[PDB]
């Protein structure tokens, strides 16, 4: 059951929630005043989205939201992580405001800390205002970081009266990645792909835009907010683990090409104000260049960094050498191996690519503490999803994801133990819901969700987390 696992086993104010972002869970898409995002529109054409779901309803959090709140108390959770749906508040990403949206965000923060729960603020996940996608080009334009800006000005003057813990961003290298080199998530941008693109210069164009937009967020959050707020700021960036096949020095700077890659991209500007130099020197001119200044107000501009990790991957590698560009992806010039010695790295979740992988968590943090002089982290989404077609009951004993968490969180002690700055862990997800493409066909909450019934049911390791986390 417990593993030893307890608030006893964790440093004292150690803060542990749950976590959603407002498309997935929220619903009333086209309602309440809210304008479309490029998710609406990416949900709602035939064949993007498993069984052509999409998020119009999703858990109807938007009218149940005292409920879930009343469950995560119950279930002894510090903090509850959510996101604002930008076009939720401005229809248009700029311009008029929706007093509705508002107000539903006022209640839910309200009510969060009536009952005693601490709320942490995303101000993008995945769902920019169609408008601002079709007036300016959305992330590829720099003028997205006046846009954001002035969206996040207006968060903080209405809400950081009461929310002191920001995130301006949700995985930016995913929205580069799948947005502009795949081109499977919207805008479905790409060399090939129908909408235009080039997979080998947007990437990177967009990483920059989300950069510079952060930091001219941070710089108007800390000159205009933060003496009378007392608040902080930081960012989500994914990270998973990557350790090299053997310990050929081939291998070895493989892995290490692949973690600067990944999650060096945003870390090294972040921490150090540079890109990092494996970077510079494989992309070249692709990489855009930070002015000193630019630079300077990128380093630093984060007060913690969220870290989304779920699983580990065998890097192998051969000697650098010169190609064509073609994409982000290529050119990591890496080769992934998903077994060692005749055995997997570990078993697959209903998602193909999450390999259930304990030490990767372990693996993540500790590079993090060593590299880049051991920054405040928060572990913003830890989980696992069940398939489609269970039973109530099915979902309900939930036995691999007690396992999950309890392997993963043992693991996140033992680099916290060994002295990782880590101030906080968030269960992705409080409930099942719209998982992105594969629609609701992906369950990862600790609560089930009947999507006929709406009806919430907490599962097995929602009770776990209970037990762990009483007081
Ligand atoms: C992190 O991962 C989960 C599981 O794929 C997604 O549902 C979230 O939107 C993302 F932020
Ligand atoms: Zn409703």
Not at 218 to 245: P, S
Not at 325 to 335: C, E, I, K, L, R
């Amino acid at each position: 059951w417990l593993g030893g696992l307890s608030r006893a086993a964790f440093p004292k104010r150690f803060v542990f929630g749950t976590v959603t972002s407002a498309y997935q869970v929220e619903g009333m898409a086209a309602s309440g005043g809210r304008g479309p995002s490029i998710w609406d529109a990416f949900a709602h054409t035939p064949g993007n989205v498993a069984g052509n779901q999409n998020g119009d309803v999703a858990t109807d959090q938007y009218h149940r939201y005292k409920e879930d709140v009343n469950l995560m108390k119950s279930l002894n959770f510090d903090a509850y992580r959510f996101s604002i749906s930008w076009s939720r508040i401005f229809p248009d990403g700029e311009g008029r405001v929706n007093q509705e949206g508002v107000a539903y965000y006022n209640n839910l923060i309200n009510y969060l800390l009536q009952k005693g729960i601490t709320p942490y603020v995303n101000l993008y996940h995945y769902d920019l205002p169609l408008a601002l996608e079709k007036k300016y080009g959305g992330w590829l334009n720099a003028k997205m970081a006046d846009l954001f800006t002035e969206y996040a000005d207006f968060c903080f003057k209405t809400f950081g009266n009461r929310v002191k813990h920001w995130f301006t961003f949700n995985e930016p290298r995913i929205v580069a990645l799948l947005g502009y080199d795949q081109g499977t998530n919207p805008p479905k941008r790409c060399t090939k792909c129908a909408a235009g693109g080039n997979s080998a210069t947007e990437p990177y164009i967009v990483a920059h835009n989300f950069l510079l937009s952060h930091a001219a967020a941070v710089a108007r959050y800390r000159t205009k907010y933060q003496a009378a707020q007392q608040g902080k700021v930081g960012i989500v960036l994914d990270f998973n683990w990557y350790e090299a096949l053997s310990n050929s020095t081939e291998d070895q700077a493989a892995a290490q090409r692949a973690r600067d890659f990944h999650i060096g991209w945003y870390l090294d500007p972040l921490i150090n104000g540079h890109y990092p130099q494996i970077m510079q020197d494989l992309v070249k001119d692709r990489l855009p260049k930070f002015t000193p200044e630019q630079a300077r107000l990128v380093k630093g501009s984060a007060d913690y960094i969220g870290i989304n990790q779920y699983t580990a991957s065998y890097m192998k590698g051969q000697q650098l050498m010169q190609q064509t560009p073609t994409s982000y992806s290529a050119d990591w010039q890496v080769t992934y191996v998903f077994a060692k010695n005749g055995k997997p790295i570990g078993p697959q979740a209903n998602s193909n690519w999450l390999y259930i992988v304990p030490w990767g968590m372990y693996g993540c943090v500790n590079y993090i503490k060593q590299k880049y002089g051991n920054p405040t982290v928060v572990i913003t989404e830890n989980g696992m999803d069940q398939p489609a077609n269970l039973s109530r009951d099915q979902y309900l004993r939930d036995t691999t994801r007690v396992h999950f968490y309890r392997s993963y969180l043992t693991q996140l002690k033992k680099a916290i133990d060994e002295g990782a700055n880590v101030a906080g862990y968030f269960a992705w997800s409080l409930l099942d819901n719209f998982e992105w493409l594969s629609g609701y066909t992906s369950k990862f909450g600790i609560v089930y969700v009947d999507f006929n019934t709406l009806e919430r049911h907490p599962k097995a390791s929602a009770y776990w987390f209970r037990d762990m986390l009483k007081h």
